[PDB]
Scaffold this active site. Structure first.
Site, PDB file in Angstrom:
ATOM      1  N   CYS A 242     -22.967  18.282  17.613  1.00  0.00           N
ATOM      2  CA  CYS A 242     -22.958  16.827  17.504  1.00  0.00           C
ATOM      3  C   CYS A 242     -21.598  16.256  17.162  1.00  0.00           C
ATOM      4  O   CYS A 242     -20.835  16.837  16.385  1.00  0.00           O
ATOM      5  CB  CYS A 242     -24.008  16.330  16.512  1.00  0.00           C
ATOM      6  SG  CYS A 242     -25.699  16.456  17.185  1.00  0.00           S
TER       7      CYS A 242
ATOM      8  N   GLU B 157     -26.646   6.138  14.332  1.00  0.00           N
ATOM      9  CA  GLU B 157     -26.051   7.467  14.453  1.00  0.00           C
ATOM     10  C   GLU B 157     -24.624   7.469  14.991  1.00  0.00           C
ATOM     11  O   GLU B 157     -24.065   8.532  15.271  1.00  0.00           O
ATOM     12  CB  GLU B 157     -26.923   8.378  15.319  1.00  0.00           C
ATOM     13  CG  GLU B 157     -27.983   9.132  14.527  1.00  0.00           C
ATOM     14  CD  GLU B 157     -27.400   9.854  13.320  1.00  0.00           C
ATOM     15  OE1 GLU B 157     -26.538  10.744  13.497  1.00  0.00           O
ATOM     16  OE2 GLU B 157     -27.804   9.523  12.186  1.00  0.00           O
TER      17      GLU B 157
ATOM     18  N   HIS C 186     -24.749  11.687  11.309  1.00  0.00           N
ATOM     19  CA  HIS C 186     -25.354  12.863  10.684  1.00  0.00           C
ATOM     20  C   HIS C 186     -24.398  13.966  10.224  1.00  0.00           C
ATOM     21  O   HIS C 186     -24.626  14.598   9.190  1.00  0.00           O
ATOM     22  CB  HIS C 186     -26.380  13.493  11.631  1.00  0.00           C
ATOM     23  CG  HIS C 186     -26.901  14.813  11.151  1.00  0.00           C
ATOM     24  ND1 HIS C 186     -27.812  14.925  10.123  1.00  0.00           N
ATOM     25  CD2 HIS C 186     -26.583  16.081  11.511  1.00  0.00           C
ATOM     26  CE1 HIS C 186     -28.030  16.204   9.867  1.00  0.00           C
ATOM     27  NE2 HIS C 186     -27.295  16.926  10.694  1.00  0.00           N
TER      28      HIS C 186
HETATM   29  C1  LGG Z   1     -26.443  17.909  16.426  1.00  0.00           C
HETATM   30  C2  LGG Z   1     -26.670  17.634  14.938  1.00  0.00           C
HETATM   31  C3  LGG Z   1     -27.272  18.855  14.241  1.00  0.00           C
HETATM   32  O1  LGG Z   1     -26.845  19.979  14.587  1.00  0.00           O
HETATM   33  O2  LGG Z   1     -28.151  18.638  13.378  1.00  0.00           O
HETATM   34  C4  LGG Z   1     -27.749  18.320  17.109  1.00  0.00           C
HETATM   35  C5  LGG Z   1     -27.527  18.726  18.568  1.00  0.00           C
HETATM   36  C6  LGG Z   1     -28.809  19.350  19.123  1.00  0.00           C
HETATM   37  C7  LGG Z   1     -28.625  19.921  20.531  1.00  0.00           C
HETATM   38  N1  LGG Z   1     -29.450  20.889  20.923  1.00  0.00           N
HETATM   39  O3  LGG Z   1     -27.639  19.411  21.315  1.00  0.00           O
HETATM   40  N2  LGG Z   1     -28.777  17.273  17.024  1.00  0.00           N
HETATM   41  C8  LGG Z   1     -29.963  17.566  16.500  1.00  0.00           C
HETATM   42  O4  LGG Z   1     -30.256  18.685  16.081  1.00  0.00           O
HETATM   43  C9  LGG Z   1     -30.993  16.434  16.459  1.00  0.00           C
HETATM   44  C10 LGG Z   1     -31.203  15.987  15.010  1.00  0.00           C
HETATM   45  C11 LGG Z   1     -29.969  15.235  14.507  1.00  0.00           C
HETATM   46  C12 LGG Z   1     -30.083  14.943  13.010  1.00  0.00           C
HETATM   47  C13 LGG Z   1     -29.775  13.936  15.293  1.00  0.00           C
HETATM   48  N3  LGG Z   1     -32.246  17.009  16.970  1.00  0.00           N
HETATM   49  C14 LGG Z   1     -32.363  17.357  18.248  1.00  0.00           C
HETATM   50  O5  LGG Z   1     -31.482  17.181  19.088  1.00  0.00           O
HETATM   51  C15 LGG Z   1     -33.706  17.966  18.655  1.00  0.00           C
HETATM   52  C16 LGG Z   1     -33.482  19.432  19.035  1.00  0.00           C
HETATM   53  C17 LGG Z   1     -32.884  20.234  17.876  1.00  0.00           C
HETATM   54  C18 LGG Z   1     -32.564  21.666  18.310  1.00  0.00           C
HETATM   55  N4  LGG Z   1     -33.168  22.614  17.598  1.00  0.00           N
HETATM   56  O6  LGG Z   1     -31.799  21.894  19.245  1.00  0.00           O
HETATM   57  N5  LGG Z   1     -34.153  17.236  19.849  1.00  0.00           N
HETATM   58  C19 LGG Z   1     -35.192  16.406  19.853  1.00  0.00           C
HETATM   59  O7  LGG Z   1     -35.902  16.164  18.878  1.00  0.00           O
HETATM   60  C20 LGG Z   1     -35.446  15.747  21.209  1.00  0.00           C
HETATM   61  C21 LGG Z   1     -34.819  14.352  21.196  1.00  0.00           C
HETATM   62  C22 LGG Z   1     -34.636  13.807  22.612  1.00  0.00           C
HETATM   63  C23 LGG Z   1     -33.904  14.536  23.542  1.00  0.00           C
HETATM   64  C24 LGG Z   1     -33.695  14.026  24.819  1.00  0.00           C
HETATM   65  C25 LGG Z   1     -34.221  12.786  25.165  1.00  0.00           C
HETATM   66  C26 LGG Z   1     -34.954  12.058  24.236  1.00  0.00           C
HETATM   67  C27 LGG Z   1     -35.164  12.568  22.959  1.00  0.00           C
HETATM   68  N6  LGG Z   1     -36.897  15.650  21.422  1.00  0.00           N
HETATM   69  C28 LGG Z   1     -37.591  16.675  21.906  1.00  0.00           C
HETATM   70  O8  LGG Z   1     -37.090  17.752  22.226  1.00  0.00           O
HETATM   71  C29 LGG Z   1     -39.094  16.431  22.057  1.00  0.00           C
HETATM   72  C30 LGG Z   1     -39.780  16.778  20.733  1.00  0.00           C
HETATM   73  C31 LGG Z   1     -41.280  16.483  20.785  1.00  0.00           C
HETATM   74  C32 LGG Z   1     -41.538  14.986  20.976  1.00  0.00           C
HETATM   75  O9  LGG Z   1     -41.499  14.270  19.953  1.00  0.00           O
HETATM   76  O10 LGG Z   1     -41.769  14.594  22.141  1.00  0.00           O
HETATM   77  N7  LGG Z   1     -39.610  17.309  23.117  1.00  0.00           N
HETATM   78  C33 LGG Z   1     -39.471  17.013  24.405  1.00  0.00           C
HETATM   79  C34 LGG Z   1     -39.968  17.878  25.374  1.00  0.00           C
HETATM   80  O11 LGG Z   1     -38.839  15.867  24.777  1.00  0.00           O
END
Ligand code: LGG
Ligand code: LGG
Lengths: 177, 180
Positions: A136, A51, A27
């Protein structure tokens, strides 16, 4: 010397596994790049597996580095360190107790990775106690015997919990970006 | 951590110190320069010294760091609190090392009586080393944490185990000496 390997790259970071091998999270890679580190694409062997992306250069880009061991994730229960480098100049190493390797779908992207729990805890608040967007590509490393091992690059995390995910390498992967 | 918070971490003697406010500087007693006639341009006779074991506070009678706001300084923190040790290294590196704080206690370290609080570094399996833990030269670094919208400082770095995973910060006490 571990920190010397963490390099700013695109919207995130990358890690020099050796003088010729650079790994990062797909990404964050700069879009429509004609070259990387002064090297033409045609001179780079790119392995893009979901990824997780690995760049293998024809020549030594970081000849000052020794070759590290790169593995596909680590045993469940292993306590790794995610080496978070920030544009502020802060070096933030965070312990993470690794969980299971698993296929995941994160915000529309297929991610082959391994989840883990930051030792800072679920009640931990603040960017200095967890990962945030922009982090990331940060490496997940640990020491086995006398060798340092890198087993993944930071890909995601829950917004309010202490769960993180690092993308892990796979045998299958594209050759282009 | 905010740039202004890092700007409070100051090279001092054989270690570091921390500006709590424009007039208050705290450090670990062990790192204080020997035979010093003044600190930050202020003669000793113009400084109110509060030396409580391994924790020393200096209060000046004029603002030395007028660019700063006053922060909250407390005697340690609740057990279980996750703090960050604001480590500055001589090459410009900044390392906010996470630490889960344990209990406050009177310890005996290398013959010195240290009223402090132990904590477990949360940087890796073994924080042994310069990239993951604290090292000689780091004493005086502040232990801080954010409570609501206030940054709180609760101790200054004083020691660590050989493996480096357990650290100790000296904490302030109500009673202290008025001399160096
Ligand atoms: C690095 C790339 C970037 O900046 O775009 C970035 C690092 C985020 C961080 N906080 O360390 N990654 C992301 O932003 C990534 C998208 C890229 C393109 C891979 N998205 C996430 O990490 C998001 C949070 C973004 C943010 N605003 O911080 N996280 C999720 O969607 C998370 C995935 C997950 C995390 C741990 C274990 C399994 C899966 N899922 C959730 O938070 C879910 C969302 C609702 C659901 O679908 O269940 N919620 C819960 C409570 O699990
Ligand atoms: C800052 C001042 C300086 O540079 O001199 C420096 C920072 C050290 C660091 N690595 O973060 N502080 C010291 O060097 C400090 C000076 C004392 C307070 C006078 N000493 C220590 O930190 C020593 C270093 C031992 C070493 N690495 O060789 N640490 C201890 O003595 C340690 C204290 C401690 C910490 C947590 C819980 C309990 C105790 N104690 C031990 O390692 C004991 C020593 C037993 C003995 O002295 O016979 N051993 C065990 C197994 O706990």
């Amino acid at each position: 010397t571990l920190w010397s390997r963490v390099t700013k790259f695109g919207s995130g970071w990358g890690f020099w596994v050796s003088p010729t091998v650079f790994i990062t999270t797909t990404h964050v890679i700069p879009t429509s790049a004609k070259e990387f580190f002064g090297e033409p694409l045609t001179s780079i062997a790119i392995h893009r597996a979901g990824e997780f992306t690995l760049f293998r250069f024809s020549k030594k880009i970081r000849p000052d580095l020794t070759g590290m061991i790169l593995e596909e994730g680590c045993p469940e229960g292993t306590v790794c360190s995610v080496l978070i480098k920030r544009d502020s100049g802060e070096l933030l190493p965070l312990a993470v107790r690794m969980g299971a390797i698993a296929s995941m779908r994160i915000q529309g992207r297929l991610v082959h990775g391994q989840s883990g729990m930051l030792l800072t805890g679920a009640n931990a608040k603040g960017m200095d106690l967890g990962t945030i967007p922009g982090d990331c590509g940060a490496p997940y490393v640990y020491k086995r015997a006398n060798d340092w091992v890198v087993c993944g690059v930071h890909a995601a995390a829950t917004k309010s919990g202490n769960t993180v995910v690092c993308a892990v390498q796979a045998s299958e992967g594209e050759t282009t970006l």
